[PDB]
C-alpha cells in the first residue's frame, strides 16, 4: 500500500496544471477519502481537497480551494488534482494522502467523521514562477592556494543559480559518502536556487569529483576539485 | 473554520527530558485530534489519532491527551531523532473548513555541546568571469547555534549574505551551516581581505583569505 504523486512541474503564473496521485497495493473503496495536502517551502501543512473512495460522488474542498482547484477520481487507482490560475503562492510540494474516517450514524443516514491520514506519497513539486528553467553553474570549493596544505582537507562544490528544485550532489559517483555535508537550498533575489556540498577527505594528492544532477533541465555536471 | 492553533511555535528540550506541545480548537472536536511528526523532505508521519490512540509502530514515548477544545502531545525521553516539526490535525470535519492542520511546532533537541569546524572557501578561478563571485564559509558539526559575521577589509558585511542550516543530525543533534557572501566581480576585485567569523557563545573562529593570495 503506497502512493506516488506526479505531474509536478515549473509553470508560469496564471498557468493550469494537473497533478496525479497513483495508488499501489490497494484501490479506492468506501473506506477512505483520497486527499491532497500541500506544503510551501519552509511552511506548514495545508489541506486542499478530499474525494470519497466509495461509489457516491462526495468531494470536499478547503475554502481557499473550491473554485480554483478540482479533485477527481479518474480510476480506482488514480485521483487527480487540477489547479488553475496558479501563482507563486501555489509553489509547494503536493502530497497525496489516504484518509481514514468513522461512519457515525445520525437520524436516517450515516456521516463521515474522525478523519486522519494514514498513508502519504512522497510528493510532487509544483513551482510557479516567471523565470525559465535554469541549469546550475558548479564551482569548486577549495582552501586558499596561498595557504599551507594540511593532511586532512575539506573540499566542495558551489551549485549556483538553478530553477526549479531540486538538484542532487554526489561525490565520486556515490563511492565517497563519509564526511559529506550538503546544505539546504536557498532561493536568491533572482528567484534562482543555490546550494553547496562539502566533503572531508585526507588524501590531498587525489582529486575528488562532485556529481551534480538537475533533472529539470536534464543536466548533469561533474566538477573535479583540486586542493 | 474550525481553527487549530498550536503553541508554542518552537520549543527546546534537553536530551532525556520531556516536551509538551499544545493544540487548541476553536470549537469542540469530540476527541477527533491527530498528531503528526514531519522531518525535512519527508511526508508527515502519523503518531496519534482519536486524541490519544498511539498509531502502530510508533514509539510509546509519544502521548496524546486532552479533550474538548485543548489537546496535548508529550514526548518523554526526548532524543535527537525527535528534532522535527509536529502538527495537530482536527478530524471532526472536512466540510466548511480552511485548514485541518495547526500551524505546527518546531521541536529542537538540545544535545551535547560541540564546537563548529569553520572553513572559508575563496571563489574558484572561473567565477569572476561570470560577473558574480560567491564566497562560501562553513561551520560543520556543532551545537548549539552559532552566529556568523562577515568582514570585508575590516568592515562588517551586512548585505549579500545567506545562511543555510542543516536540520539537526538525528543521532547527535548537531547542525551544519553554510554562510555565503555574494558580490559582483567588480565589488570583489576592489577589496583584499575576506573574513568569516563563527561565534558559538564564548568561542569564536575566524577564517580569512586575501584575494591576491588565491
Amino acid at each position: 500500500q503506497s502512493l506516488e504523486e506526479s505531474g509536478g512541474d515549473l509553470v508560469k503564473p496564471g498557468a493550469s496544471l494537473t497533478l496525479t496521485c497513483t495508488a499501489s497495493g490497494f484501490s479506492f473503496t468506501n473506506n477512505y477519502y483520497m486527499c491532497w495536502v500541500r506544503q510551501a517551502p519552509g511552511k506548514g501543512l495545508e489541506w486542499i481537497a478530499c474525494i470519497y473512495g466509495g461509489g457516491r460522488d462526495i468531494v470536499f474542498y478547503a475554502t481557499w480551494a473550491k473554485g480554483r482547484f478540482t479533485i477527481s477520481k479518474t480510476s480506482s487507482t488514480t485521483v487527480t488534482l487540477q489547479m488553475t490560475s496558479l501563482t507563486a503562492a501555489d509553489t509547494a510540494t503536493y502530497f497525496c494522502a489516504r484518509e481514514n474516517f468513522d461512519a457515525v450514524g445520525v437520524g436516517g443516514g450515516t456521516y463521515s467523521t474522525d478523519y486522519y491520514f494514514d498513508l502519504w506519497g512522497p510528493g510532487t513539486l509544483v513551482i510557479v514562477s516567471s523565470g525559465q528553467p535554469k541549469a546550475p553553474s558548479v564551482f569548486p570549493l577549495a582552501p586558499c592556494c596561498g595557504d599551507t596544505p594540511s593532511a586532512t582537507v575539506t573540499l566542495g562544490c558551489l551549485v549556483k543559480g538553478y530553477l526549479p528544485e531540486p538538484v542532487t550532489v554526489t561525490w565520486n559517483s556515490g563511492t565517497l559518502t563519509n564526511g559529506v555535508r550538503t546544505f539546504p537550498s536557498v532561493r536568491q533575489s533572482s528567484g534562482l536556487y543555490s546550494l553547496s556540498s562539502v566533503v572531508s577527505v585526507t588524501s590531498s594528492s587525489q582529486p575528488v569529483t562532485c556529481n551534480v544532477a538537475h533533472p529539470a533541465t536534464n543536466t548533469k555536471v561533474d566538477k573535479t576539485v583540486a586542493p | 473554520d474550525i481553527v487549530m492553533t498550536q503553541t508554542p511555535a518552537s520549543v527546546s528540550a534537553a536530551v532525556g527530558g520531556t516536551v509538551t506541545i499544545n493544540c487548541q480548537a476553536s470549537e469542540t472536536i469530540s476527541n477527533y485530534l491527530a498528531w503528526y511528526q514531519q522531518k525535512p523532505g519527508q511526508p508527515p508521519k502519523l503518531l496519534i489519532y482519536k486524541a490519544s490512540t498511539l498509531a502502530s509502530g510508533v514509539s510509546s514515548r509519544f502521548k496524546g491527551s486532552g479533550s474538548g477544545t485543548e489537546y496535548t502531545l508529550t514526548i518523554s525521553g526526548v532524543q535527537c531523532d525527535d528534532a522535527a516539526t509536529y502538527y495537530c490535525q482536527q478530524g471532526y470535519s472536512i466540510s466548511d473548513i480552511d485548514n485541518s492542520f495547526g500551524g505546527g511546532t518546531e521541536v529542537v533537541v538540545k544535545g551535547d555541546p560541540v564546537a563548529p569546524t569553520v572553513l572559508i572557501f575563496p571563489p574558484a578561478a572561473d567565477q569572476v568571469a561570470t560577473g558574480t563571485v560567491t564566497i562560501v564559509c562553513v561551520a560543520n558539526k556543532y551545537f548549539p547555534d552559532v552566529t556568523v559575521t562577515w568582514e570585508v577589509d575590516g568592515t562588517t558585511q551586512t548585505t549579500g549574505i545567506e545562511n543555510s542550516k542543516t536540520p539537526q543530525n538525528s543521532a547527535d543533534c548537531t547542525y551544519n551551516l553554510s554562510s555565503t557572501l555574494t558580490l559582483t566581480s567588480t565589488q570583489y576585485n576592489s577589496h583584499k581581505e575576506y573574513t568569516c567569523k563563527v561565534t558559538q557563545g564564548t568561542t569564536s573562529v575566524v577564517q580569512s583569505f586575501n584575494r591576491g593570495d588565491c
Partner: peptide, 9 residues
C-alpha cells in the same frame, strides 16, 4: 456507504 460529512446532518 455514507452520504456526507458529520457537519451536514
Amino acid at each position: 456507504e455514507i452520504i456526507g460529512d458529520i457537519r451536514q446532518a
